[PDB]
Structure formats: C-alpha cells, structure tokens
Design a protein around this ligand. Structure first.
Ligand SMILES: [K+]
Length: 371
C-alpha cells in the first residue's frame, strides 16, 4: 500500500478534457489541488475553446477519486491510491434520462509531483433543444442573497420596529435558534447575522424571515459552524400542491412529506402553502457505490446524479464506471462500499472566460443496513 504516501498532504492537480458532444467540440483545462486527508478538492476549470456547449454541472463527475477521504478502517478498500503513481484508466457511460449519453475515457496518474486527469469525452444522441444542449440546467444554487415575492407571506405590519416584529414572529412560531440571530430590515431587505447554526437551522430562519409580507430579499450573513450542501429554495405557484411540487423537484409525489417536514414549524400543514411562499427543498441524497471487478484487476461503480432544471424539475444522469490500473503491480480490490460527495459550484466575478470554480468533499463508507 505504497501509494497512500503520495496523498498525505496537498497535491497539485492538472485536468485536461477534449470533448465533442453531437459534433460540438470543446476543450477544458483545470488547475488546483486536492487534500485527500480531508477528501477535499479545490479546482477551477476554463473552457479554452470559447463557450462550453453543455452545462458545466454535467461535466463535474468526469472532470480524481484518489482524493476521496478513506478513513482508517477503509484504507484496505482504497483502490484509487493503491494504483498510484502509475495510475488507472477510468471509463464511464453516463445516460441522461430522456436524452443523450456521454462516454468517457480518462487516464489518472502522477506526472512528477502533479496528479493529472486527462480525459476524452464523446456525447451523442442529444436533443438540440434538450436540457443539455439547450442549457436548461441550473448552474448552482443561489448564494448569499435570496429573493422572495415581496408581498407574499405573513402580514406583520401594514404599509428596527420592523426587525423587532420579525424577531418576535420567528420566536412566536418556534423557529429553532431564532435567539442566535440578529435581524435588520431596510426597505424590504432583511439582513440576518449569526454564528454557529446548522445549515438546516439557518435555512429555516432565512425562509421564515423572507416569507413575510413586505420582505423582498434576505441577506444571509449567518455562519454555519459546519458547511454541508444547501437546499433548493422553491417558490410556490398558484395551483401547486406539495405532491405536485415533489413530483417535479424529486420525480415522484411520494416524497411530498419530505418537503413538509423540512419546512416545519413555519408550515403547519400541507394545505397551508400559498402562492409566493418559499419552501426549503431538502436534497434527495445520492451516493457513489463501488464494487471490485477482480478478473479485470480494478473496480466498478454505479450512481446517479440529480441535475436541477432551471424552471423546475430534475434531470437524472445514470453513471456506470470501470477503473483499470495502468501499472502491473498488485492493487487493492475493495469490498463493496460507497462514497459520499458534497459539491459546490461558483463563479469568479472577475473571470471573463467560460469557467467553473469547484469545491468538493468526498468520504468513503461501508454499506449500511438501510442500503
Ligand atoms: K415576502
């Protein structure tokens, strides 16, 4: 198990992708670094040929799982590092439901002190007005400033006494940790400041202040003691039901109670949603499932990605993966396990080329009972 030595600290990363999707050719270069002790990746990608013809999110999985955090009890199962520095070949087919597919072949290996991921991608059969080539997928979840339908929500005053009325509302309705934030109201703009809340507790506070009549935006100045993926925020439409919303955002109405619970105690029952109300849509988690493929000396994985569609819905991307070592030295062939991935996409306001900034955390784990 030599290869783990190479990952004990911060390691620079080069990524190069040459892609052609339905004859639309493009290239991507990536620079940054990974820290496998923390399963952490910090990378920025640039479309070097111009504008990217597909949504950036659809390329994330293709654009170095040797940087996954494998805890001590899991190191027996870390195929990815055991193949270093000679590396591995990583191949996938990605089936976008009701649309085209990507086929990818990548070489992942050290070149000097740098871990390099060189990729060839070919996409075919996509609908030129589909969600992919039509650029209908949301890039990321809005940060920092959240917008609400200004005149929707609880009526706390007619048209610091305003911020006082808000704080009393948060308290009276039972919003957890309302006593750990400070509210400021400036002409339809609320600023919420606080420290050491959960991601979930923060989100419930933000939504409860925004769902007040006369509040058009909420400035999230709240630090979470600990990150974690944010939820989607959904604006209720005339005619909506929680069941129909669930069908759109998750794919089935049978997850409607997931939305209801995630918006308690602000929301008292499924029938009390109203047009213009913002609701938290908690992530439906997807894991990466890995298995060994010994008579090929590597591993297989399967998983799916949920890509949010901008104007409502989810585009599923089914992934099937095979990894084969490049070197002939023995490698670790793991037991069945899974990886848990948290990813955040952002933009450099000063960058002018088509790009993607990526922050990612990945951890390994053993298959659970509920699985
Ligand atoms: K409002």
């Amino acid at each position: 198990s030599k290869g783990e030595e190479l990952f004990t600290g911060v390691v620079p990363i080069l990524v190069e992708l040459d892609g052609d999707v339905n004859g639309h050719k493009f290239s991507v270069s990536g620079e940054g670094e990974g820290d496998a002790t923390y399963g952490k990746l910090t990378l920025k990608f640039i479309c070097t040929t111009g504008k990217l013809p597909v949504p950036w999110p659809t390329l994330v999985t293709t654009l170095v799982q040797c940087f996954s955090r494998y805890p001590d009890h899991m190191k027996q199962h870390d195929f990815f590092k055991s193949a270093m520095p000679e590396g591995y070949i990583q191949e996938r087919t990605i089936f976008f439901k009701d649309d085209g597919n990507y086929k990818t072949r990548a070489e992942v290996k050290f070149e000097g002190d740098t871990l390099v991921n060189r990729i060839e991608l070919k996409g075919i059969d996509f609908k030129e007005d589909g969600n992919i080539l039509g650029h209908k997928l949301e890039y990321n979840l809005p940060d920092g400033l959240f917008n609400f339908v200004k005149d929707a929500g609880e009526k706390l005053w007619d048209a610091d006494d305003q911020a006082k009325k808000v704080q009393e509302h948060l308290n009276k309705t039972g919003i957890p940790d309302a006593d750990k934030v400070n509210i400021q109201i400036a002409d339809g703009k609320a600023t919420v400041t606080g420290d050491g809340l959960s991601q979930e507790a923060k989100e419930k506070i933000l939504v409860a202040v925004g769902n007040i009549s006369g509040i058009a935006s909420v400035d999230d100045q709240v630090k979470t003691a600990t990150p974690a993926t944010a939820s989607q925020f959904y604006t209720v439409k005339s005619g909506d039901t929680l069941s129909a919303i669930s069908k759109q955002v998750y794919g089935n109405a049978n997850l409607y109670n997931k939305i209801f619970e995630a918006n308690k105690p602000m929301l008292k029952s499924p029938d009390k949603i109203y047009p213009g109300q913002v609701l938290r849509i908690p992530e439906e988690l997807e894991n990466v499932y890995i298995k060994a493929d010994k008579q090929k000396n590597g591993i297989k994985a399967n998983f799916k990605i949920r890509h949010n569609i901008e104007d409502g819905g989810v585009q599923l991307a089914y992934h099937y993966q095979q990894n084969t070592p490049i070197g002939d030295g023995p490698v670790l062939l793991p037991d069945n396990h899974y990886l848990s991935v948290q990813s955040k996409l952002s933009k450099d306001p000063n960058e002018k080329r088509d790009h993607m900034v990526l922050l990612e955390f990945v951890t390994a784990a053993g298959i659970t009972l509920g699985m």
